[PDB]
Amino acid sequence: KESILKKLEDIKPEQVKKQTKLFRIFEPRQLPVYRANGEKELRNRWYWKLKRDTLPDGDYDVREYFLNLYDQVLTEMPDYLLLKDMAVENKNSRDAGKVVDSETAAICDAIFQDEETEGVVRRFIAEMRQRVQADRNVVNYPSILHPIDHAFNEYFLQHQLVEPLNNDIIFNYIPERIRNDVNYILNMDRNLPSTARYIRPNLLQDRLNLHDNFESLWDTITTSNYILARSVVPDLKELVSTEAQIQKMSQDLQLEALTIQSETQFLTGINSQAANDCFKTLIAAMLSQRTMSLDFVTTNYMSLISGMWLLTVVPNDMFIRESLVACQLAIINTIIYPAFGMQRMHYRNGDPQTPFQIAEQQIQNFQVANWLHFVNNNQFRQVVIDGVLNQVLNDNIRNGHVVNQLMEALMQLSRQQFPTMPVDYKRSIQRGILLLSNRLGQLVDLTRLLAYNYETLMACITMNMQHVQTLTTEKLQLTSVTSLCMLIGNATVIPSPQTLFHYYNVNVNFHSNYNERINDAVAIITAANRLNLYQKKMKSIVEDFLKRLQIFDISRVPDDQMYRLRDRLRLLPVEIRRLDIFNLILMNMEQIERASDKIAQGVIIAYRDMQLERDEMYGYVNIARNLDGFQQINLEELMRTGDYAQITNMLLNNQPVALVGALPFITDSSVISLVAKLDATVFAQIVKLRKVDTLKPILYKINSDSNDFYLVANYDWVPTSTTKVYKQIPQQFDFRASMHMLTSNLTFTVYSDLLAFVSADTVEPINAVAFDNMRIMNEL
């Protein structure tokens, strides 16, 4: 009864994230430049290369790489940022400005200090500084970036989540009802500036409908909220003393010592610590919507009497059927039908009608039939208020008037002889109900108090409070109900605003975390589906979704619930941040895979003496960059279903073909390896043994640094070859065009908690008033 509360209360808010380093995938790099004819220039040139060439072989592994990249980027994706933090100083600026990142200035310095750079670029480095405008609290900082990097950074800037803050938003963050409750007064001691910001939760209701066929998890959630709610219900105050009440009860009952009586048992369970137990059980159950059973005994007729009050002010749908069926049946047999000479009863076990139903249409008395009508037709009114569903009472219970019909009924039973039964039975019953008649006003005010605290604590709920019977129940002793109904008076007790703010913050944190973890899971699921990841079993992800909901034990959960939950999660859309990041990855993933000079995008085979291309970062290369004409064979299809008949038939008969899939390669840089046709010696291993993993095409990069290049100048032969490689080239580093200006705010501040500036206090609780502007606990 303490681990669960600690699991809840230790759910921190979502730690506000931030970044200090720009997102980057690419970096410049100097390479040589070999002029056409192949020979070398005294000058070099910059190119865009990747950081972290960690791309695997095979296309499936590549798509897993981009999945893990997407997860990394979402981790790095911030919520707010100020650019002045990451800023640095350009050592070569006219106005001694600042640029945005360390690596930016490193690039600028490297380029400026070099010898082979134009004057325009150095000018452009001397002209680039930081601009402010404190009117709008806006800054523009320069930056150097690849266009993918710019895409991600700009998305981070524009789509960051912060909202201006002021005291009006501190109020409106509080629920309506509590501000509208006159019994609470609220002030503060600060005036927040326009500079201030705050992050908002995600209090979106359950997309997953755990109130439908996930009854074990729902029992868990419901229990957790129940035993939280117990922690916030007030403890009663200024109760009646137990001996002072027991003496009245005993003298009213005239307990003879010698003779045996049913009337001693009415003193069973009259202590305090049960009154508070019932008071804390009923409300917590109605808030959590957790069902509860009734343990009791058929000889303590006071329990059966107090059950009347109970079944009035608490709906029959709130209990489990067999328990209140037994209770109603006991009551019918031993208070009601003997009080009109009716039969005892003949109640079938699984009868669809509960005993108070067919009792409503046998007896002939208006008061008792009206009482029974209310009981049988009392039920929670569903109503959506301030975004949240609420299980609201009748509003004939919120005021205490039901108790008056209950009194009418009990008095119209007191005025009935029991012709069937002896004097002592009647005597017992009539005494037992005098004990409650004399507590009438206390009962009225008690009912009002319960309803008041129920709605007041309901106001501090964020998740829709569905009503469904749970697996597991809470025990309710009717002796505690008797104790509450008997020991209560002249003492209103109201939840302190601190308990209210705590019960609100707990639910808010849990609710936001629920929604955010849902978004996580849906993101990874949709991404694995759209990346065609077909071997991936989506089970670990649901474990990561449940371990983060810190109330469930996964060591004892099944493995089919995870996939049902997955089936629900696939249907949910993605949020905007994650979806847009993913779509920025999709339209650019191929371009990233073009880079990473470790794998190539396929190898052509064409038994014809084709020509090598005049690329200038290389010299002559056996490179292809269109893959048009010669047809193509995918490799994942071949590595799934080994059917090497096609490729074998094509290789043995020397048919042109292309092979498509991420494949390694070696850079060979010898003309003697070219003339001898060695790049066609790599494929004979496929037919011997039918694996395609030892497949490393040659990349004949030829230049004036290749140890035999004297031939090329001195015989006038264009290097020709067979079996070209499919691969694009790097993109040249244009400094001016790779430069950008980054907009951001200037010097805001972020606040996580929000109900700290409030300072609340109640009015004096005796002059505490309900919705009807008519006092509660006034019967004196």
């Binding site: 600060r190 927040l192 601190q498 501040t749 972020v750 606040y751 996580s752 908690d753 700290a756 500036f757």
Partner: peptide, 14 residues
């Protein structure tokens, strides 16, 4: 507690 929870958020301002 709450007083330290208020103190952090007053101090971000102060």
């Amino acid at each position: 507690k709450e007083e330290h929870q208020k103190e952090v958020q007053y101090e971000i301002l102060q």
